[PDB]
Structure 1
Amino acid sequence: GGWVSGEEFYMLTRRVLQLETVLEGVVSQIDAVGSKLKMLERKGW
């Protein structure tokens, strides 16, 4: 169904960028949480 311009590709390309930037930040808080949970487990809680 038609051609694709670089303008819309670039546009879509940035959305993917923001997703990577936001998903990386999320994954990080989860690791930082999943690990105090671990310290708590090592401590007896």
Structure 2
Amino acid sequence: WVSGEEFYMLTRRVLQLETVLEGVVSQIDAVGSKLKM
């Protein structure tokens, strides 16, 4: 009962979310360090 249109859409979305989250892990590691001052 599940089309390839929606499944593929969702996998693209998930992939974009992955790359965004790479950037964000970068920012949070940036912020955490240098949080000693």
Normalised-by-shorter TM-score class: 0.7 to 0.9
Partner of 1:37, secondary structure, is coil
Rg: which structure is higher? 1
Residue ranges of structure 1 left out of the alignment (5+ in a row): 40-45
Q: What is the aligned partner in structure 2 of residue 17 from structure 1?
A: 15
What percent identity do the matched residue pairs reach? Answer: 100
State the shift of 1:19 in Å.
Answer: 0.9
State the shift of 1:5 in Å.
Answer: 1.0
Partner of 2:30, secondary structure, is helix
Instruction: Return the alpha-carbon distance in structure 2 between the equivalents of residues 38 and 27 of structure 1.
Output: 18
State the shift of 1:38 in Å.
Answer: 3.4
State the shift of 1:24 in Å.
Answer: 1.4
Instruction: Return the alpha-carbon distance in structure 2 between the equivalents of residues 30 and 13 of structure 1.
Output: 25
